[PDB]
Amino acid sequence: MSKGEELFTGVVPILVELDGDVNGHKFSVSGEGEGDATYGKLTLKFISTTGKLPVPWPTLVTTLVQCFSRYPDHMKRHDFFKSAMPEGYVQERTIFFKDDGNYKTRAEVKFEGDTLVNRIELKGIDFKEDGNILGHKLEYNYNCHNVYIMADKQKNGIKVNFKIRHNIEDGSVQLADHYQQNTPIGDGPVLLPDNHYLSTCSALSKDPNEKRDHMVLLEFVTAAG
């Protein structure tokens, strides 16, 4: 339980801000939509306020609000994300692209008044000028995964991990090895969870009215374990 989850009993307006620089390539991304922790649902819209994105959209998916996951009633004791609100948390990642570059991200997710805000900073390097990332070899789609979470006492948060399986144009897949940290920005009490994971699905599509380089995202997530 947490006074914090109370803030997600209904639909919640969401905004995303991303500043990234891959292999020196500079890009800005904006997102807006809403969240339904109730149902484990996200409906989001993103575009590049900077032109044709330098990396494939799906490389950005993880980086672009785990607090919207749906935690089963017997799950309540282990929901760090919501518990942290509205003061929010820091979310940092290091992501390894098999036989290619990596991303380092630093984000804060918090309420900004009536909105849940995800503000991120991204850095990519060691990217193969002619790899699937830089030569956009990834097909616009997304697999379902399991986000494994454990407590991080000292940190006072959670240690998170998973590997994304990105579908390659050549019919193969490409591993996106995620290394993740979440810490409470606030000073109030948080739930430190036993081990578990999040059952994550997302679906990528396009908005036929959109000119700018963009992506329409939908996520469903439920806790388990």
From Swiss-Prot:
Phenotypic consequence of residue 195 to S: In EBFP1.2; shifts the excitation and emission spectra to shorter wavelengths and increases quantum yields compared to BFP
Effect of residue 200 to H/W/F: Results in significantly red-shifted excitation and emission maxima
Phenotypic consequence of residue 46 to L: In mut3.3; shifts fluorescence lifetime from 3.03 to 1.88 ns. In R10-3; matures to the red-emitting state with excitation and emission maxima at 555 and 585 nm, respectively
Known outcome of mutating residue 203 to K: Abolishes the tendency to dimerize and leads to monomeric fluorescent proteins
Effect of residue 100 to E: In mut1.27; shifts fluorescence lifetime from 3.03 to 2.85 ns
Applied biotechnology uses: Green fluorescent protein has been engineered to produce a vast number of variously colored mutants, fusion proteins, and biosensors. Further generation of mutants led to more stable proteins (at 37 degrees Celsius for example) with brighter fluorescence and longer fluorescence lifetimes.
Result, substituting residue 65 to L: In EYFP; leads to yellow fluorescence, folds faster and more efficiently at 37 degrees Celsius and has superior solubility and brightness
Protein's name according to its UniProt entry: Green fluorescent protein
Name of the encoding gene: GFP
